[PDB]
Amino acid sequence: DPKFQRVALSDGHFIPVLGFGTYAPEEVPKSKAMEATKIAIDAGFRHIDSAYFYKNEKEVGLAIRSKIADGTVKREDIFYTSKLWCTFHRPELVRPSLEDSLKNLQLDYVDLYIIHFPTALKPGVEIIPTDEHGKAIFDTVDICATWEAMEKCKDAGLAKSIGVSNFNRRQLEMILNKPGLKYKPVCNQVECHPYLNQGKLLEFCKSKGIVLVAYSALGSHREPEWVDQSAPVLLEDPLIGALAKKHQQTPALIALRYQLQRGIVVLAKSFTEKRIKENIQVFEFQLPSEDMKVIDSLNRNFRYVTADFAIGHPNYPFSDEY
Numbered sequence: 001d002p003k004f005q006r007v008a009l010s011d012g013h014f015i016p017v018l019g020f021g022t023y024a025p026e027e028v029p030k031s032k033a034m035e036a037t038k039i040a041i042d043a044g045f046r047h048i049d050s051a052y053f054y055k056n057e058k059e060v061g062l063a064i065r066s067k068i069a070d071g072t073v074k075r076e077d078i079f080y081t082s083k084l085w086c087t088f089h090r091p092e093l094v095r096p097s098l099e100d101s102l103k104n105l106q107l108d109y110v111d112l113y114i115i116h117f118p119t120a121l122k123p124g125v126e127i128i129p130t131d132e133h134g135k136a137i138f139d140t141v142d143i144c145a146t147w148e149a150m151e152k153c154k155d156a157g158l159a160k161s162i163g164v165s166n167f168n169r170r171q172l173e174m175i176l177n178k179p180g181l182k183y184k185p186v187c188n189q190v191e192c193h194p195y196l197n198q199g200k201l202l203e204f205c206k207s208k209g210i211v212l213v214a215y216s217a218l219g220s221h222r223e224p225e226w227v228d229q230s231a232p233v234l235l236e237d238p239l240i241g242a243l244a245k246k247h248q249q250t251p252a253l254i255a256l257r258y259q260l261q262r263g264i265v266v267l268a269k270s271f272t273e274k275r276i277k278e279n280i281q282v283f284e285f286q287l288p289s290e291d292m293k294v295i296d297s298l299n300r301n302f303r304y305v306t307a308d309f310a311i312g313h314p315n316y317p318f319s320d321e322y
């Protein structure tokens with residue numbers, strides 16, 4: 001079945017091309033990620049994307065283990081991703097954080113463990129420590145030192161593959177060029193959609209054998225406190241709509257298909273049963289090249305995720321052109 005198709009990672013493992021996103025706004029209970037991940041697995045999703053920062057790994061782990069126990073899948077059929085949060089970048093904190101995730105999931109390994117952002121923050125109890133004025137407190141940690149601790153996690157068997165998220169081209173070169181490098185990042189998970197199509201970073205990643213993984217491919221949750229209401233609304237875009245009508249699909253499906261045909265691994269979050277089922281219908285139609293070119297005209301360098309917490313940090317990723 002085409003919906004189970006996978007893309008080769010540089011390390012010899014394989015990643016399903018469509019993934020299920022599990023983040024939701026803080027008012028949504030974590031149970032809904034559990035319930036939705038069960039439905040996703042039933043619908044045919046096998047790649048599941050989470051993070052320490054989402055505070056949902058006990059719930060997503062329960063979902064996965066329930067679907068292993070009712071025989072819908074085996075562990076090896078699931079591709080689960082987690083992410084190292086910025087307050088754990090110090091080398092001594094990386095494996096213990098992954099081990100905590102694994103204890104919360106009740107799983108023996110993750111398929112993929114990635115550095116969530118390139119900006120280390122002060123370690124401690126707070127997930128985003130701040131000062132008196134509500135600004136985040138930075139830390140100074142060499143990203144290469146964090147990377148070597150990620151390599152040790154692969155060697156320990158706790159992560160089948162390792163990668164990065166929200167890195168720019170300069171930052172990927174830092175790791176690629178690290179003396180002693182043992183494992184190249186297998187991916188770079190970044191925002192990507194028709195308003196931010198990532199064409200330059202994609203070409204760079206492809207030149208280096210790194211898979212680009214797209215988040216906010218359906219336009220995000222648009223939470224205030226990360227997105228100004230003046231943000232363009234991807235799923236209401238009238239041209240995406242016209243193409244959805246042309247193909248007898250939906251806007252969401254156009255947005256997802258665009259990414260698949262560019263060699264991108266695309267995430268899609270939905271906690272609505274009908275939509276979960278819809279989204280995996282992306283494998284049931286194709287776009288012609290002329291329509292791909294039209295969708296390329298939508299690019300406007302618009303980010304739903306600016307990571308304002310990290311503005312002023314030396315490793316802030318989004319100042320460079322790519």
Ligand SMILES: NC(=O)C1=CN([C@@H]2O[C@H](COP(=O)(O)OP(=O)(O)OC[C@H]3O[C@@H](n4cnc5c(N)ncnc54)[C@H](OP(=O)(O)O)[C@@H]3O)[C@@H](O)[C@H]2O)C=CC1
Nearest residue numbers: 021022023049165215216217218219220252269270271272
């Ligand atoms: N590495 C990183 O820094 C980041 C990683 N991520 C990952 O990427 C995932 C996806 O990105 P995210 O920004 O969460 O959201 P998406 O861009 O995937 O959009 C989710 C929104 O689209 C809605 N939606 C889903 N499918 C449809 C459909 N078929 N028709 C209409 N609306 C639909 C959802 O509603 P509903 O659920 O109510 O159905 C939700 O409101 C995250 O969950 C997370 O796993 C995201 C941001 C950052």
